[PDB]
Amino acid sequence: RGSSAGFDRHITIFSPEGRLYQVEYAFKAINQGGLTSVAVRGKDCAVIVTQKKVPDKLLDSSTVTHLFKITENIGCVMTGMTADSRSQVQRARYEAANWKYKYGYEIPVDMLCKRIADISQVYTQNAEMRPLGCCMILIGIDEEQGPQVYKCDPAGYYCGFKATAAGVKQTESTSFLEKKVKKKFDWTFEQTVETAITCLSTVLSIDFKPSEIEVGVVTVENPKFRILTEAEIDAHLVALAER
Amino acid sequence: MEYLIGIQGPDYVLVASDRVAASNIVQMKDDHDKMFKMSEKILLLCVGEAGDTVQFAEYIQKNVQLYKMRNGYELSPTAAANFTRRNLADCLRSRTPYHVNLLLAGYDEHEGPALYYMDYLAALAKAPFAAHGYGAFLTLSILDRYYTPTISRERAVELLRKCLEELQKRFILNLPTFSVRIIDKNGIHDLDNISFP
Amino acid sequence: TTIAGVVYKDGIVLGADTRATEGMVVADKNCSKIHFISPNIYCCGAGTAADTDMTTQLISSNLELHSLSTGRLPRVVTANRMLKQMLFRYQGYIGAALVLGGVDVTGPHLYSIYPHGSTDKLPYVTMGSGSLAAMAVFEDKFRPDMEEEEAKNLVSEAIAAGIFNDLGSGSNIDLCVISKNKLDFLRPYTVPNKKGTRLGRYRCEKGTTAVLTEKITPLEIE
Amino acid sequence: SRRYDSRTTIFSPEGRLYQVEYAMEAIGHAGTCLGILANDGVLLAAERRNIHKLLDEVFFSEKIYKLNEDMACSVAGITSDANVLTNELRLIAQRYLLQYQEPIPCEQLVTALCDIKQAYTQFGGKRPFGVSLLYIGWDKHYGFQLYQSDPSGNYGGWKATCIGNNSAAAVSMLKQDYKEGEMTLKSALALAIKVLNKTMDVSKLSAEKVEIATLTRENGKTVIRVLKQKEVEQLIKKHEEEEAKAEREK
Amino acid sequence: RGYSFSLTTFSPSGKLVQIEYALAAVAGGAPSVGIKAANGVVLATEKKQKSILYDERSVHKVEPITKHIGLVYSGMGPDYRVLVHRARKLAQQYYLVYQEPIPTAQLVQRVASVMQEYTQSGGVRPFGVSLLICGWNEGRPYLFQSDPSGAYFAWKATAMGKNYVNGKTFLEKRYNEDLELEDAIHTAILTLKESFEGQMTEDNIEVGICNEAGFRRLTPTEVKDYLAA
Amino acid sequence: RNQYDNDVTVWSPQGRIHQIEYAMEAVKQGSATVGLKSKTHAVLVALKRAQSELAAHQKKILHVDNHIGISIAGLTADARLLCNFMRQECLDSRFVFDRPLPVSRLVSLIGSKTQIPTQRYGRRPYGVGLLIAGYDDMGPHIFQTCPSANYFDCRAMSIGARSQSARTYLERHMSEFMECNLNELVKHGLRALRETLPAEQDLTTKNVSIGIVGKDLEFTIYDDDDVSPFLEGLEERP
Amino acid sequence: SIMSYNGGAVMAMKGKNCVAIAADRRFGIQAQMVTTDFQKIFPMGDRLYIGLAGLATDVQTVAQRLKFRLNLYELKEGRQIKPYTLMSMVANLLYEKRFGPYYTEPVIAGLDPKTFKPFICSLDLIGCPMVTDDFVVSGTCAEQMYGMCESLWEPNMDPDHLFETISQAMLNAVDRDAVSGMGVIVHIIEKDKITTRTLKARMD
Amino acid sequence: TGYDLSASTFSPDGRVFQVEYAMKAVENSSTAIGIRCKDGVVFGVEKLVLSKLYEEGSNKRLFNVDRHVGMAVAGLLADARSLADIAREEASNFRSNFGYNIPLKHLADRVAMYVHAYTLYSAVRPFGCSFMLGSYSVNDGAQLYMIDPSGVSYGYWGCAIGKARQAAKTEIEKLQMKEMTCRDIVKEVAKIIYIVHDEVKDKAFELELSWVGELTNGRHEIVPKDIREEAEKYAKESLK
Amino acid sequence: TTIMAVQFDGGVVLGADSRTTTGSYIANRVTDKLTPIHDRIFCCRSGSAADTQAVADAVTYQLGFHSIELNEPPLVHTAASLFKEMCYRYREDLMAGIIIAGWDPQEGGQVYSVPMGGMMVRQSFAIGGSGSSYIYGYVDATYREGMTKEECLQFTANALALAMERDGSSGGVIRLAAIAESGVERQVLLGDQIPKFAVATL
């Protein structure tokens, strides 16, 4: 099946089957980072959780973080190559501000993820430049739609999700989540946070402490993106462990 | 200042020009040639601001002879006229406007003789007779009087001499001698220069 | 030219005359000074007519792109910002004075745009030659939260004042009513002035005119 | 980057351009096409390769691609490159008309396009235009004309020719059958049907398979007319009758 | 800046192997189908999602270019989105110039010109998608297919993606020119059902129609109503 | 094997760029030269190679400005290119600020211009090694340049073929050079350069060129005629 | 008045299943005539005509550019252009030169090819479309022929009455201005045929 | 593998091997450390002296990219100087536009993105240098950021780059910089460098030190020679 | 028009009229010249309305991008510097006079004045527009160090009313704003709310 001809593996051109082997290798590069992130939307809130693995004590834990603030009402979590991630969030910030300047209102997350995916497309189409080895997950509140969660990939797939996972444990995490959403739930704020943390803790076997993870939220009551402090995270965790 | 005149007929085009090149009060030259041949059977007459005339004329001459060498057959007078009109019209908007007043003349085996007129604004027109310069105001009424589409070439030369002698008597500038040449199926023919001592 | 707009309770009413003048002679007696930007956004134009028409067409295009890309209806602030940025880029040389009106999710929004790129969000605006008379009518009789019929009558009275007191404007009144749910484009909403009947018949019989040539060419049809 | 480059615009040790050689080979696979000059007119004829039943007919012709009042061009090879070249041709002709206010000569049009094709051969590092296309038209200088073009950027004037599949067999048939200076449009149509029947793999020309267009001068205004299915049906019927009469004789 | 040499080049056989391979990716694409009725034209495709977690309403494989044109694809989605964006820009350029809605024929000509521009241009791969374009102009319906090569064909009805050969055989068996779009929708849904490999529902597929009114993608409710048959 | 070497933008698996090393090897083949300084004076001494007996020897030492002079090694075309660049930099300095350009800032510019090509495709390092010498308000300076754009600051240095003998001689005698007269300093440098020569060859007026700069003395190149006084008192080969 | 440099006048009128378009013949400098055979009406279709007045060089240039674009359109589409479409194309063409404009004021007149419905329009210096149901004008004697047409014109006229009307209007108008005249040509368009007639007019 | 010859490629296991090969180079360079403390930040370098000929201050591996921020590098010194030029340009443009001294976080981000541009395209190689930036502002405080050739930027309480990165990190880890101040920190910085220096493999070194903090009024500068000598003496004596 | 700003301890006060004129005709009698560049940073606008709106939007764009990438609240000096470079680079084209005021933690309440020509000056109190001429004396006399929020608001209202009665271009309703750590308190004085001063009334 997996035949190869010419420079199909070395650059972004079609294999005899049309697979574009390179973008698949870029997908492997996401798991090369070694971390995992999970997203889930409720009726009134959306969240993103991810590991916070500090290899050295000397590193400032404040600086290292995969959660970023694209706008006041948008936040994202990046997984993969840290450098390409920072490039993508900078480009997203640019596109958001330019959208505001041109069209006069805050960009929707769907349009943002579509713009980012088109950008990644021009990478995977042109041979000069490699695809960025990162995947973005965006959360935001749309006034009409409600809470929203979208994920981008190096290829350009930009779908919208009720819940998502990204990283090395993506398949296990989505297997976990597919069972939960298959069952009916109210999906309140505390329930969403508990679901996300449980998914991460179950796939990793970590049994997290407060510093071990980071989390960000958006609520219809408080649409601004907020990265919860260690106190709030520990408050949620102690609640989880008790029940 | 410079004077051009053209008379179409059944089987020929007659053209004339003054041979004066003047910068100012003085007359520098008395044998200036304002007639440029773009091919064997078409002529271009150009007058206006100095330099623009020869530059534009030589450009058109180059393009026409190039067409001939490339394709093996000469342009028709109509095609040459529209070509020079295009090149002139493109430029009036540009930073390099050519202020030139033109009069084209040619013979086509199929379409017969032709005379075209275009001002510095590059407005083309096909006319039976036409003239340029301040002298045109004097001489056009002569042609409108004594011109017939069936005019023979001897009668045409006679009519020309009438126009030019009227210029000599009535026009302030000194245009002593005029170049003359005829276009027909055989080709361009130079004639005895009309002079007034 | 006299264009005017007003916000009523649940939408917008735009109004305009139909007289287009080249100099001081009438050229078009039933012009359409009301343009389509979007299904929910409309605009009326004054000033250089070509500039207004082409600008409105351009912004209509860009908003068509934006709307069908987003999957949701376009907003008014978007149009206002596009227009003002364009007009500022050209620094007033394109003489498009516009009153722009539309209804979107946030509510009815009405803008007045000037050639140099200025804007003003207002409840009522008037532009053109009869703008002062229309402003007089509005400053007199405008009240907030009017009903649709009251707003239509007000705008009609304003455009009529501009008509019967300005030389440039005349010949008809056009109306457009945008709301959350409908759009009523009323081209001959009113006919205040009409051409009087011709008393004398001056129809010329055949052969009245001489002809020196005639050439008939048949057109094949199938 | 030197590693990922094909290096198309280079010579070969034998002195060849392998890319245009291969483009000619691709044209060898394309649907066959031919054009036949006559004293009174010229006609293009093609094998409509897209013969599927579900295909609609929303175009004037599948391949004929009119360029101007006085000329047209059938096609062999990649339809995409063909469409691009036809657009370029139309632009060229209308540019000449804008300049001189006379219709363009066919030789000049073909020369312009062939120069464009040659440029892709020589520089740019781009692939050539893998298209060979006939041209037919009328100019006052030389009258009815037929021209052939190749991806190499070289053209020729032919009295009758074929491009595409089995062009060699078509030409072998045309050499013997074509009568120099002794042809009319009807006889040329018959010869076209003959060589199409000989060259095409179809047992019989259904009149869906073929597409024919003619060029003629009527009242000082040239006309480019695609022949209708009834006309070509009558033609193939006449050809079958003639073939039977020849066979019945012997 | 960028590579300036063609990545697609002629094989000794004469075939553009990159184009053949792009067509292979299209063949591996999801099913899609189009049927041109007398009164209208229908475009349909399956929207099979890997998991229930995905939101169906988020993304649409059926996208409208204008009021009266909409198209669907089989193959690479990002490439499809590049193409649909550029097509919208082209159609609105036409509208700015002519103040008349673009004919679908000219649209597909232009986008095919683009798709040609990519295969010939340097430092790029061909678009790995084929499109089905539907339109209603001059009170007539249209259906077109644009391949990666940049070649446009016109069909009364056709299919794309997996099992397109069997789908086209079935469609040639079941197609009538006199059909109304009401029955055409049933035939298209049946064609997709031939290769759906599942229990298709309102979420599992996407469909759109074009008519005198214009192009619209049917909501899941009426899609379910049609699926009842 | 040929991989990792054909291009400059390719890091080797051992964390090296072979093309830069090769350009440095180009300098290691070139004609030998010496640079040394004292409290007040800076000297540049050169062996000028001759392609044949009849050929005149190559111009190793160049003028850049009154207060700066260079001695080249390796590709003379790259050398003349860099020298034109440096001349333009110093001329721009005098045009703008009406001051002599400092040597340190000049070599900073040189390193920048030399670093840009070695990080891009389809460009080569400047396969040249230089010794800079000048006098500024600070004092005499000697800077070495390599195709690798890194530069150095040194009391003495020698680059070219068989330069290592000169380097060890200079390392041995570095102590005295700081406090020396001009004649003593140039004689030290000449002995150092003499070490680089083959045992058969010997220094001559023809094959030697000297460039000297100082507080009052502008940069002056002493050709074969006027180089004889400096080497007049030199000892014989041991 | 740069428009008055060459003068000229063009007019169009509507009727029942018919349109008429007319224009003067004079080509002249600001006071000097040159030719009485100038083409200001150019055919843009089988039964669609455009008429240009203003600076003659811009008249010719615009007609040539328009024929260029139009032939490309007719070749690409495969159909004849509609009048509204030609109007829009002309407006785009003129607005492309909005700074440094073509000094001409076009007039288009024709029938829709499918329904044979009359269409007339005019465009300003810079491409302001102006569709009307009765008549349109462009030229120096516009002010004259406006009132002349306002009086003579009547709705749903047949071709005969249309010809007599447009002829009387053009003659009595151009007789009253200096820089236009020297004859006038009248093209009548209807579904079955095209009719062109020149009128006897004062050559003064 | 054929996947290692350009940075526009990817390994089948997801790695761009050119970047890894690049950071091998900085790992083959003499080590440098920077240690943040309450008062400010201190930098230190093991500048191997290649020859007795080279003058004191040659191959300076400590730059001042702006007055309020310092720099300390490893790897290819040419690329280091180039990035110092880039950083100075970024700081100057920031001051010119926004009117104040650039924050070190933004500076490190901009520099890292400029680095990261190079590892994507094939026309350009990755940088061969990893480097530490350090600054002190009264509002922002002491701040230290280390950058790698991959373009990844992280803040550090103490950072090390070069061959002896690991042992340096250990010796820093036992330090407890948070309570300390600069005048104390310089001494054990010297200690750590003298430790990790290999007398056998590395012939000799010249300690290059730089600091910034409130003591300098937010002005990065090289250590006065008196303190440099005192710290070197303490280090050698403690070394035993 | 008349625009005015005053710095009090812990914040600032902004005041401006609501009149914009084209000649002697008032196109808009309720225009809002106070513009939020950011949550705690505001801009008053004098001169060409087009120029001021344009540069305000561009500065808002740049400053939002800068603030979000820094992840810290922006500075009034920064916004004023942006306005400065824009107005200085385009001093020939732009006829615009700006006064910027906001609150930031580092420096607190700040007022900067960017007149025509693109120079930037921090000021305790700064007035602009056609009507500032008529009230230079009133502010010079009335100002005192240590004024409070309500005191500064009344000061600004009196000044703007005095300018409005005399200047034809200035007029309408007074729009006021007060910016501090807490947030923005905007209010509009109209009719009798506006302070009144007795005419000569001979």
Curated annotation (Swiss-Prot), chain A:
Glycans are attached at S3. It is found in: Cytoplasm; Nucleus. It holds the Pfam family Proteasome. GO terms for biological process: positive regulation of canonical NF-kappaB signal transduction; proteasome-mediated ubiquitin-dependent protein catabolic process; proteolysis involved in protein catabolic process; regulation of inflammatory response. The modification Phosphoserine is found at S15, S61, S62. InterPro entries: Ntn_hydrolases_N (IPR029055), Proteasome_alpha (IPR050115), Proteasome_alpha-type (IPR023332), Proteasome_asu_N (IPR000426), Proteasome_sua/b (IPR001353), Proteasome_subunit_alpha6 (IPR034642). Keywords: Acetylation, Cytoplasm, Glycoprotein, Nucleus, Phosphoprotein, Proteasome. Gene3D superfamilies: Glutamine Phosphoribosylpyrophosphate, subunit 1, domain 1. The modification Phosphotyrosine is found at Y157. The keyword Nucleus applies. The modification N6-acetyllysine is found at K100, K102. The 26S proteasome consists of a 20S proteasome core and two 19S regulatory subunits. The 20S proteasome core is a barrel-shaped complex made of 28 subunits that are arranged in four stacked rings. The two outer rings are each formed by seven alpha subunits, and the two inner rings are formed by seven beta subunits. The proteolytic activity is exerted by three beta-subunits PSMB5, PSMB6 and PSMB7. Interacts with ALKBH4. NCBIfam families: PRK03996.1. Belongs to the peptidase T1A family. This is Proteasome subunit alpha type-6. It comes from Homo sapiens (Human).
From Swiss-Prot, chain B:
The 26S proteasome consists of a 20S proteasome core and two 19S regulatory subunits. The 20S proteasome core is a barrel-shaped complex made of 28 subunits that are arranged in four stacked rings. The two outer rings are each formed by seven alpha subunits, and the two inner rings are formed by seven beta subunits. The proteolytic activity is exerted by three beta-subunits PSMB5, PSMB6 and PSMB7. (Microbial infection) Interacts with HIV-1 protein Tat. The keyword Ribonucleoprotein does not apply. PROSITE patterns: PROTEASOME_BETA_1, PROTEASOME_BETA_2. SUPFAM superfamilies: N-terminal nucleophile aminohydrolases (Ntn hydrolases). Keywords: Acetylation, Cytoplasm, Host-virus interaction, Nucleus, Proteasome. InterPro entries: Ntn_hydrolases_N (IPR029055), Proteasome_beta2 (IPR035206), Proteasome_bsu_CS (IPR016050), Proteasome_sua/b (IPR001353), Proteasome_suB-type (IPR023333). Its main location: cytoplasm. Gene3D superfamilies: Glutamine Phosphoribosylpyrophosphate, subunit 1, domain 1 (3.60.20.10). PANTHER family: METALLOPROTEASE TLDD, PROTEASOME SUBUNIT BETA TYPE-1. The keyword Transcription regulation does not apply. Pfam families: Proteasome (PF00227). This is Proteasome subunit beta type-2. The gene is PSMB2. It comes from Homo sapiens (Human). The modification N-acetylmethionine is found at M1.
UniProtKB/Swiss-Prot annotation, chain E:
Coiled coil: none annotated. InterPro entries: Ntn_hydrolases_N (IPR029055), Proteasome_alpha (IPR050115), Proteasome_alpha-type (IPR023332), Proteasome_asu_N (IPR000426), Proteasome_sua/b (IPR001353). CDD domains: proteasome_alpha_type_2 (cd03750). The modification Phosphoserine is found at S4, S11, S13. The keyword Metal-binding does not apply. It is found in: Cytoplasm; Nucleus. Its main location: cytoplasm. GO terms for cellular component: cytoplasm; cytosol; extracellular exosome; extracellular region; ficolin-1-rich granule lumen; nucleoplasm; nucleus; P-body. Changing L107V: In a colorectal cancer sample; somatic mutation. Keywords: Acetylation, Cytoplasm, Nucleus, Phosphoprotein, Proteasome. PANTHER family: PROTEASOME SUBUNIT ALPHA/BETA. This is Proteasome subunit alpha type-2. It comes from Homo sapiens. The gene is PSMA2.
Swiss-Prot record, chain I:
The active site is at T1. Keywords: Acetylation, Cytoplasm, Host-virus interaction, Hydrolase, Nucleus, Phosphoprotein, Protease, Proteasome, Threonine protease, Zymogen. The modification Phosphothreonine is found at T35. One of its GO terms (biological process) is proteasome-mediated ubiquitin-dependent protein catabolic process. It is found in: Cytoplasm; Nucleus. GO terms for cellular component: cytoplasm; cytosol; extracellular exosome; mitochondrion; nucleoplasm; nucleus; proteasome complex; proteasome core complex. It comes from the Eukaryota. GO terms for molecular function: cadherin binding; endopeptidase activity; threonine-type endopeptidase activity. Induction: Down-regulated by IFNG/IFN-gamma (at protein level). Up-regulated in anaplastic thyroid cancer cell lines. Its main location: cytoplasm. It catalyses: Cleavage of peptide bonds with very broad specificity. Its EC number is 3.4.25.1. It is an enzyme of class 3 (hydrolase). Belongs to the peptidase T1B family. Component of the 20S core proteasome complex involved in the proteolytic degradation of most intracellular proteins. This complex plays numerous essential roles within the cell by associating with different regulatory particles. Associated with two 19S regulatory particles, forms the 26S proteasome and thus participates in the ATP-dependent degradation of ubiquitinated proteins. This is Proteasome subunit beta type-6.
